[PDB]
């Protein structure tokens, strides 16, 4: 700061402590119901995926 301020790099970061990350298995990432739409999507049902 001031008239003699030194040339400077700007650094950016975040914290998100008590959380646990989530990725809903739903076609549009919304909680439309507990049994999701993709969980009913009977392509990826009976003919089982790795």
């Amino acid at each position: 700061i001031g008239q003699t301020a030194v040339p400077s790099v700007t650094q950016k970061k975040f914290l998100c402590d008590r959380v646990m990350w989530r990725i809903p298995f739903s076609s549009n990432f919304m909680s439309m119901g507990a049994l999701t739409d993709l969980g009913q999507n009977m392509l990826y049902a009976n003919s089982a995926h790795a």
């Binding site: 700007t10 950016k12 970061k13």
Partner: protein, 59 residues
Amino acid sequence: AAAAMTATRMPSSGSSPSVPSSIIAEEKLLALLAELEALSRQLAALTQQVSELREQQQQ
């Protein structure tokens, strides 16, 4: 590759008011144009009475 990578890394704007003082105004203006005529009238009246010396000395 690692260690530091956890965080992240013109011409003319043409101002005008600068570092001078404040300013004020008032509306009681302008007798002054009369004296320019006062001065040049009375100046003639000087010469007019210099002439009145000469025009009496010449008699």
